[PDB]
Chains A and B, each alone.
Chain A
Amino acid sequence: LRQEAEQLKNQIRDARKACADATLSQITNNIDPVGRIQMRTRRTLRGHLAKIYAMHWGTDSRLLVSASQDGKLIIWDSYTTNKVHAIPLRSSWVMTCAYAPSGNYVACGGLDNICSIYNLKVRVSRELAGHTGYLSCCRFLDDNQIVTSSGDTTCALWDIETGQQTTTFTGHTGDVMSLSLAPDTRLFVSGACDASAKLWDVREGMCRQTFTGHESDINAICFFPNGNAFATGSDDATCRLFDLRADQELMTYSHDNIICGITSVSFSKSGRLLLAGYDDFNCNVWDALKADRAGVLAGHDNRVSCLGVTDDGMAVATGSWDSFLKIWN
């Protein structure tokens, strides 16, 4: 029974150990440091009532979407600070939000177990339901497909018109809390309450790889722009960068001073900077190749809950529990 599983685990551990010739730090020790980075709050939105939970930049580098515990989903224009739209949610709690690349649809879902989707040309076009538990994160593959992460330890791939789960990516111990998409639509990964963070293929529907190798409670995942690597934030103080081709770890971003975990992780456009929000009121940035902190961002009144870097790389927007979204450049 479990003997085969133990043998397989030993085999994969041996393969990972054999494949690890020289660590990333060993190669990167001869690379110029990024140096100190000064980030200033260019514009503060401050148009929210309660603590906000998640945000998502639009395909254009301007528009925003933020969801708060007040139950109101407000679309924000970063350049002008004017509120383009304010779509109330039937559920008072919205655990996440998403902006479609088309821009004609916005999805927000929370503890209601329904991934409500709004049409911007603001009415609920279709509400997708079928998850046993709460939702954690939603992303748009296209204008007609959306992948949701549920508290039932399953991730699903929906179709808007059909309204049914096209594929269910079962096989996870803990509840998934965050997922990210590859630059292409073929692959996407997620990390659960269990330390395991697995890679999935939207076509096959099977977990191609499983990394884990973390303490507990992975809370945020982002893709390196190249798509060959992804970084996981966890309730442990450390933040790690994995690797799909090597199927193992590369570097661990930990500091003695920090004792809180991670809440959101997002790379820069070039991938050199790994911006990671913290349970502490201030966000931290890391040199993705040197594993050295570059500069602490300004703090909010409460803990941060989301990060987002523009598709053009213009600025990074962080929204905390203080109901304030502070665009940083």
Chain B
Amino acid sequence: QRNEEKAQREANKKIEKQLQKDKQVYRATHRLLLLGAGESGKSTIVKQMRIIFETKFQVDKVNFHMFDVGRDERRKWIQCFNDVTAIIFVVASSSYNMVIRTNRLQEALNLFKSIWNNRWLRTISVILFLNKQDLLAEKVLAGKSKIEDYFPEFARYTTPEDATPEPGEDPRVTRAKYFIRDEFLRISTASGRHYCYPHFTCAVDTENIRRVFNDCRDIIQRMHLRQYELL
């Protein structure tokens, strides 16, 4: 009879209403991904943001979701994350001297190259964090491992006068940190749908949440501007 059809239509209407409510709840939530090395210190960034592992935090009444995929050398799950607003990349800037039986920083550079030139995620920006800045400063000041020993490009490298450094009270650590940043920046610029946003951060610092908020806002603004052809 038609009673079964009427009941099925009622169930469909209820499910559609619930789906609309869920869509309203979900379209306002922004997804982020943590992609950092084991020694990169992603745990410190996770702790700073909180203050598969899913972390939810709300900034200015805007909800965020942060997913960490946790060896997996052949990353095939990366194509799943195509709707995320940005990809949070964490690389230990003090791990230049550390060697894997290829420097760890060079491995991170190769990982960044693989992520940037990915066919599936071509409109996904990257938020870059460089933890262990204090450790990098200590390593550069000590001079036990020369920055030019593993990176020959430091021979002709010069500090960029345009970039105003923080009051680190030492030109050497500033030059090293800016070289490390410029490597990633050149790798990203070698490819304008998505952008790279470097940041110098320390484990003590807790202002990373506002940095992520502002950077995601700028990412959405740039996406809209390019969609409307104003940039």
A residues apposed to B, CB below 8 Å: 47, 49-51, 53, 69-70, 72, 74, 77, 80, 82-86, 91-93, 95, 111-113, 133-134, 151, 174-175, 177, 193, 217, 321
Contact = CB atoms under 8 A, between A and B. Distances in A.
B9 A72 contact: no
Contact of A49 (B9, B11, B26): B26
A27 B124 CA distance: 50
B8 A80 contact: yes
B3 to A, nearest CB: 14
A113 B53 CA distance: 12
A53 B83 CA distance: 14
Given A82-B11, A86-B15, A175 B74 contact: yes
Nearest to B67: A92
Interface of B: 5, 8-9, 11-12, 15-16, 18-19, 22-23, 26, 52, 54, 65, 67, 69, 72, 74, 76-77, 80, 82-83
Chain A, interface SS category = loop
19 contacts: A47-B16, A47-B19, A49-B19, A49-B22, A49-B23, A70-B26, A82-B8, A82-B12, A84-B8, A84-B11, A86-B15, A86-B18, A86-B19, A111-B52, A111-B69, A133-B72, A151-B76, A174-B74, A193-B76
B80 A83 contact: no
Nearest to A49: B23
Contact of B52 (A53, A91, A174): A91
A188 B9 CA distance: 39
Contacts of B82: 51, 321
Contacts of B8: 77, 80, 82, 84
A111 B8 CA distance: 33
A83 B69 contact: no
Nearest to A152: B72
B59 to A, nearest CB: 20
B15 A83 contact: yes
Contacts of B19: 47, 49, 72, 86
Contacts of A93: 52, 80
A80 B69 CA distance: 39
A53 B74 CA distance: 20
Contacts of A95: 80
Identify the interface centre among A74, A86, A113, A175: most chain B CB within 10 Å of its CB. Answer: A86
Contacts of B80: 53, 69, 93, 95, 111
A50 B80 CA distance: 11
A74 B14 CA distance: 13
Nearest to B80: A93
Nearest to B74: A193
A293 to B, nearest CB: 24
Contacts of A84: 8, 11
B79 to A, nearest CB: 10
Given A49-B26, A69-B83, A174-B74, A92 B11 contact: no
B12 A83 contact: yes
Contact of B72 (A53, A74, A151): A151
Given A80-B8, A82-B11, A134-B77, A92 B54 contact: yes
A50 B19 CA distance: 12
A74 B15 contact: yes
A49 B16 CA distance: 11
Nearest to A260: B119
Contacts of B26: 49, 70
B76 A177 contact: yes
A51 B8 CA distance: 26
Contact of A72 (B22, B69, B72): B22
A220 to B, nearest CB: 13
Contacts of B72: 133, 151
Nearest to B82: A51
Nearest to B31: A92
A321 B83 CA distance: 11
A80 B9 CA distance: 9
Given A72-B22, A111-B52, A112-B52, 8 more contacts: A69-B80, A69-B83, A86-B15, A86-B18, A113-B52, A133-B72, A134-B77, A177-B76
Nearest to B7: A82
B63 to A, nearest CB: 13
Contacts of A113: 52
Nearest to B52: A111
Identify the interface centre among B15, B65, B74: most chain A CB within 10 Å of its CB. Answer: B15
Nearest to A302: B82
A95 B18 CA distance: 23
A72 B22 CA distance: 10
